[PDB]
């Protein structure tokens, strides 16, 4: 998932 | 009078992201559905995949579900982008 990738 | 159930999420993507990978759009769609399913019963989930602001709309069964979604997602990071989440204004189309 792409969630939380800064 | 209006008890808002629709959450507008912005900066999730740029439409150029889908130019050279045909799978990214649905990967994002499901990423969003999986995350938002924790906040409430989803009635409708839409990605405006040609909108330059990277817009998605998620409609919930209860207004408290939209509030919980807004609280959790606003300012969170997604694929290297900081996203916004806000209650729909009831008038703007995407
Ligand atoms: Cl849907
Ligand atoms: Cl129901």
PDB file of C-alpha atoms and ligand atoms in Angstrom:
ATOM      1  CA  UNK A   1       0.000   0.000   0.000  1.00  0.00           C
ATOM      2  CA  UNK A   2       0.874   3.617  -0.444  1.00  0.00           C
ATOM      3  CA  UNK A   3      -0.446   4.623   2.913  1.00  0.00           C
ATOM      4  CA  UNK A   4       1.896   6.759   4.929  1.00  0.00           C
ATOM      5  CA  UNK A   5       4.838   6.896   2.476  1.00  0.00           C
ATOM      6  CA  UNK A   6       6.418  10.320   2.961  1.00  0.00           C
TER       7      UNK A   6
ATOM      8  CA  UNK B   1     -30.005  20.988   7.703  1.00  0.00           C
ATOM      9  CA  UNK B   2     -27.553  18.901   5.605  1.00  0.00           C
ATOM     10  CA  UNK B   3     -25.778  16.176   7.640  1.00  0.00           C
ATOM     11  CA  UNK B   4     -22.756  15.594   5.438  1.00  0.00           C
ATOM     12  CA  UNK B   5     -21.795  11.994   4.658  1.00  0.00           C
ATOM     13  CA  UNK B   6     -19.484  12.618   1.662  1.00  0.00           C
ATOM     14  CA  UNK B   7     -15.728  13.136   2.181  1.00  0.00           C
ATOM     15  CA  UNK B   8     -13.663  14.841  -0.546  1.00  0.00           C
ATOM     16  CA  UNK B   9     -10.005  13.682  -0.531  1.00  0.00           C
ATOM     17  CA  UNK B  10      -7.458  15.698  -2.533  1.00  0.00           C
ATOM     18  CA  UNK B  11      -3.836  15.314  -3.734  1.00  0.00           C
ATOM     19  CA  UNK B  12      -4.025  11.512  -3.883  1.00  0.00           C
ATOM     20  CA  UNK B  13      -2.407  11.417  -7.309  1.00  0.00           C
ATOM     21  CA  UNK B  14      -1.833  13.424 -10.448  1.00  0.00           C
ATOM     22  CA  UNK B  15      -3.485  12.221 -13.689  1.00  0.00           C
ATOM     23  CA  UNK B  16      -0.045  11.893 -15.295  1.00  0.00           C
ATOM     24  CA  UNK B  17       0.597   9.020 -12.860  1.00  0.00           C
ATOM     25  CA  UNK B  18      -1.779   6.875 -14.955  1.00  0.00           C
ATOM     26  CA  UNK B  19      -0.169   7.696 -18.301  1.00  0.00           C
ATOM     27  CA  UNK B  20       2.576   5.047 -18.061  1.00  0.00           C
ATOM     28  CA  UNK B  21       1.185   2.490 -15.659  1.00  0.00           C
ATOM     29  CA  UNK B  22      -2.335   1.167 -16.363  1.00  0.00           C
ATOM     30  CA  UNK B  23      -2.534  -0.616 -12.988  1.00  0.00           C
ATOM     31  CA  UNK B  24      -1.903   2.336 -10.655  1.00  0.00           C
ATOM     32  CA  UNK B  25      -5.461   3.707 -10.820  1.00  0.00           C
ATOM     33  CA  UNK B  26      -7.143   0.532  -9.521  1.00  0.00           C
ATOM     34  CA  UNK B  27      -4.342  -0.059  -7.010  1.00  0.00           C
ATOM     35  CA  UNK B  28      -5.127   3.398  -5.595  1.00  0.00           C
ATOM     36  CA  UNK B  29      -8.866   2.731  -5.705  1.00  0.00           C
ATOM     37  CA  UNK B  30      -8.467  -0.356  -3.560  1.00  0.00           C
ATOM     38  CA  UNK B  31      -5.881   1.211  -1.235  1.00  0.00           C
ATOM     39  CA  UNK B  32      -8.511   3.838  -0.482  1.00  0.00           C
ATOM     40  CA  UNK B  33     -11.384   1.378  -0.085  1.00  0.00           C
ATOM     41  CA  UNK B  34      -9.395  -0.831   2.289  1.00  0.00           C
ATOM     42  CA  UNK B  35      -8.421   2.134   4.462  1.00  0.00           C
ATOM     43  CA  UNK B  36     -11.825   3.848   4.430  1.00  0.00           C
ATOM     44  CA  UNK B  37     -13.749   0.634   5.220  1.00  0.00           C
ATOM     45  CA  UNK B  38     -12.345   0.975   8.754  1.00  0.00           C
ATOM     46  CA  UNK B  39     -14.175   4.307   9.202  1.00  0.00           C
ATOM     47  CA  UNK B  40     -17.684   3.208   8.243  1.00  0.00           C
ATOM     48  CA  UNK B  41     -19.935   1.545   5.720  1.00  0.00           C
ATOM     49  CA  UNK B  42     -18.985   2.905   2.318  1.00  0.00           C
ATOM     50  CA  UNK B  43     -21.949   3.728   0.082  1.00  0.00           C
ATOM     51  CA  UNK B  44     -20.000   5.033  -2.909  1.00  0.00           C
ATOM     52  CA  UNK B  45     -16.312   5.483  -3.699  1.00  0.00           C
ATOM     53  CA  UNK B  46     -15.178   7.470  -6.717  1.00  0.00           C
ATOM     54  CA  UNK B  47     -11.821   8.504  -8.107  1.00  0.00           C
ATOM     55  CA  UNK B  48     -11.834  11.520 -10.427  1.00  0.00           C
ATOM     56  CA  UNK B  49      -8.846  10.185 -12.315  1.00  0.00           C
ATOM     57  CA  UNK B  50      -8.542  13.114 -14.721  1.00  0.00           C
ATOM     58  CA  UNK B  51      -8.941  15.826 -12.110  1.00  0.00           C
ATOM     59  CA  UNK B  52      -5.670  17.779 -11.733  1.00  0.00           C
ATOM     60  CA  UNK B  53      -6.059  18.003  -7.965  1.00  0.00           C
ATOM     61  CA  UNK B  54      -6.040  14.225  -7.487  1.00  0.00           C
ATOM     62  CA  UNK B  55      -9.587  14.070  -6.150  1.00  0.00           C
ATOM     63  CA  UNK B  56     -11.537  11.184  -4.599  1.00  0.00           C
ATOM     64  CA  UNK B  57     -15.014  11.139  -3.010  1.00  0.00           C
ATOM     65  CA  UNK B  58     -16.089   8.620  -0.342  1.00  0.00           C
ATOM     66  CA  UNK B  59     -19.750   8.584   0.813  1.00  0.00           C
ATOM     67  CA  UNK B  60     -20.615   6.845   4.088  1.00  0.00           C
ATOM     68  CA  UNK B  61     -23.810   5.555   5.681  1.00  0.00           C
ATOM     69  CA  UNK B  62     -23.558   7.844   8.751  1.00  0.00           C
ATOM     70  CA  UNK B  63     -22.194  11.401   9.145  1.00  0.00           C
ATOM     71  CA  UNK B  64     -20.078  10.268  12.106  1.00  0.00           C
ATOM     72  CA  UNK B  65     -18.294   7.906   9.712  1.00  0.00           C
ATOM     73  CA  UNK B  66     -17.403  10.812   7.417  1.00  0.00           C
ATOM     74  CA  UNK B  67     -16.132  12.793  10.432  1.00  0.00           C
ATOM     75  CA  UNK B  68     -13.889   9.879  11.556  1.00  0.00           C
ATOM     76  CA  UNK B  69     -12.561   9.548   8.010  1.00  0.00           C
ATOM     77  CA  UNK B  70     -11.841  13.282   7.792  1.00  0.00           C
ATOM     78  CA  UNK B  71     -10.120  13.290  11.185  1.00  0.00           C
ATOM     79  CA  UNK B  72      -7.865  10.365  10.269  1.00  0.00           C
ATOM     80  CA  UNK B  73      -7.002  11.159   6.659  1.00  0.00           C
ATOM     81  CA  UNK B  74      -6.514  14.930   6.601  1.00  0.00           C
ATOM     82  CA  UNK B  75      -2.791  15.626   6.417  1.00  0.00           C
ATOM     83  CA  UNK B  76      -1.850  11.961   6.077  1.00  0.00           C
ATOM     84  CA  UNK B  77       0.709  10.872   3.493  1.00  0.00           C
ATOM     85  CA  UNK B  78      -0.148   8.722   0.469  1.00  0.00           C
ATOM     86  CA  UNK B  79       2.438   7.605  -2.082  1.00  0.00           C
ATOM     87  CA  UNK B  80       4.701  10.550  -1.268  1.00  0.00           C
ATOM     88  CA  UNK B  81       1.869  13.116  -1.372  1.00  0.00           C
ATOM     89  CA  UNK B  82       0.339  14.854   1.640  1.00  0.00           C
ATOM     90  CA  UNK B  83      -3.423  14.603   1.177  1.00  0.00           C
ATOM     91  CA  UNK B  84      -6.343  16.664   2.432  1.00  0.00           C
ATOM     92  CA  UNK B  85      -9.735  15.369   3.483  1.00  0.00           C
ATOM     93  CA  UNK B  86     -12.787  17.571   4.036  1.00  0.00           C
ATOM     94  CA  UNK B  87     -16.562  17.308   4.110  1.00  0.00           C
ATOM     95  CA  UNK B  88     -18.102  17.845   0.675  1.00  0.00           C
ATOM     96  CA  UNK B  89     -19.463  21.357   0.285  1.00  0.00           C
ATOM     97  CA  UNK B  90     -22.680  19.949  -1.235  1.00  0.00           C
ATOM     98  CA  UNK B  91     -22.268  21.894  -4.489  1.00  0.00           C
ATOM     99  CA  UNK B  92     -18.865  21.363  -6.155  1.00  0.00           C
ATOM    100  CA  UNK B  93     -18.548  18.707  -8.858  1.00  0.00           C
ATOM    101  CA  UNK B  94     -15.263  17.040  -9.838  1.00  0.00           C
TER     102      UNK B  94
HETATM  103 CL1  LIG C   1     -18.513   2.053  -4.998  1.00  0.00          CL
HETATM  104 CL1  LIG C   2     -28.112   0.445   6.473  1.00  0.00          CL
END
